[PDB]
Amino acid sequence: XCFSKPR
Amino acid sequence: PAKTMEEASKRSYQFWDTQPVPKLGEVVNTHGPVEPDKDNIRQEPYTLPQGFTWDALDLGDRGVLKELYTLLNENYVEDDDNMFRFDYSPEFLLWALRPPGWLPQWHCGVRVVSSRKLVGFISAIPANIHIYDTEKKMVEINFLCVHKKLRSKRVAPVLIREITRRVHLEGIFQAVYTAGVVLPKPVGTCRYWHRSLNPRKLIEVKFSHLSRNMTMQRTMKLYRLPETPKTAGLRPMETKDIPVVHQLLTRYLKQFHLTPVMSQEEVEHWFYPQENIIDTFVVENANGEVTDFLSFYTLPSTIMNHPTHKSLKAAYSFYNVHTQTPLLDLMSDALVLAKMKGFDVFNALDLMENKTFLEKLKFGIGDGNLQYYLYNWKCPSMGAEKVGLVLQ
Ligand SMILES: CCCCCCCCCCCCCC(=O)SCCNC(=O)CCNC(=O)[C@H](O)C(C)(C)COP(=O)(O)OP(=O)(O)OC[C@H]1O[C@@H](n2cnc3c(N)ncnc32)[C@H](O)[C@@H]1OP(=O)(O)O
Ligand SMILES: [Cl-]
DSSP states (O other): OOOOOBO | OOOSHHHHHTOOOTTGGGSSSOOSSOOOOOOBOSSOOOSSOOOSOOOOOTTEEEEEOOTTSHHHHHHHHHHHHHHSOBOTTSSEEEOOOHHHHHHHHOSTTOOGGGEEEEEETTTOOEEEEEEEEEEEEEETTEEEEEEEEEEEEEOGGGTTSSHHHHHHHHHHHHHHTTTOOOEEEEESSOOSOOSEEEEEEEEESSHHHHHHTTSSOOOTTOOHHHHHHHHOOOSSOOSTTEEEOOGGGHHHHHHHHHHHHTTSSEEEOOOHHHHHHHHSOBTTTEEEEEEEOTTSOEEEEEEEEEOOEEETTOSSOOEEOEEEEOOOEESSSOHHHHHHHHHHHHHHTTOSEEEEESOTTTHHHHTTTTOEEEEEEEEEEEESOBOOOOOGGGBOOOOO
């Protein structure tokens, strides 16, 4: 539901 | 949109102010509906802009399923910098959209009248939800999508109102959903974390890049994994395991404040392994007793505008239940299994007890918050570690 990638 | 609570404080929500949700600003000290159940429901579908029509999608029609795949593959959620887009497969969509109790009218599409092109979608599936001391029949809302050429034209508020109407017609008045944007009003805020499995690929596609200061060599060695899991008696879930997986999950989830309440049929649907959709492994011990299980689902993404790498293969932590095997050992085996199956990255939220293993297993914190929301239900917010609910 929400596309994350490493901070 | 507003992705932080900062940019959201500075916004006015013309649509969400009309809806039975709490205000962003207020803080909640009560438990219960925002408004009473309606005993008469609008019979007519809401009006769409001229040239568009409602169409309920029969996903049993392979051609219709493919139209939905294409709409989502081209227009659904992207990362913050427009580098990756979710690429839900057709078979995954069938899994997520036809659980027990699914209704065809809750697969709510929008089409162009002339061309019949699918340009909008929203869905609802029924679920029993345990929220603090209350259990409610609800729907889960998923896959809200408006074609890119049709955006910023109020189509999304109409899709929300129309699925609300169709859910009300069936006597359900609460819903649960998630989003990467901040809206009135999150019941909990979770953070995605990422575990590199194929760090080479992840860096050449700029999903991640080298921590300072580290070589590609150090980075690979840091993320290497065993070639086989370590836990004794780990094996794929089978039909005979459905009751005990149901029992384990039910007891494990009682310790959290927002959870699903699954029937045994729903347990079979959500956990019985399907290649390229959902993987579930149980621990059968030396006495033949199933004492733990781990699960993760398959959700790849399109890599946009890239000449050589077209897709990222992501695994997502689903539900992990431990009663004898340490959670850390369970999740370490999940990483190994994902690596074996060809996944490039393993994603997990910081909900349930995941914070106890994320850093130790070398997850890196992501840039994405996943907000959890209830519709027409007022209750105190909770910390991520009390959220015991995972959606697709
Ligand atoms: C009882 C049953 C009840 C069931 C209903 C329960 C509620 C379900 C609610 C939906 C749960 C979905 C769960 C999932 O699937 S979360 C996934 C959301 N999907 C995507 O992000 C796919 C890619 N994006 C899109 O396709 C479009 O940007 C969307 C579809 C978002 C339209 O976007 P567009 O740019 O064309 O906007 P507009 O001009 O049409 O309309 C603007 C209004 O839309 C509000 N908005 C924007 N994004 C979201 C969002 N993600 N959730 C809820 N509301 C959202 C926005 O704040 C504004 O309201 P306000 O700012 O004026 O107040
Ligand atoms: Cl269907």
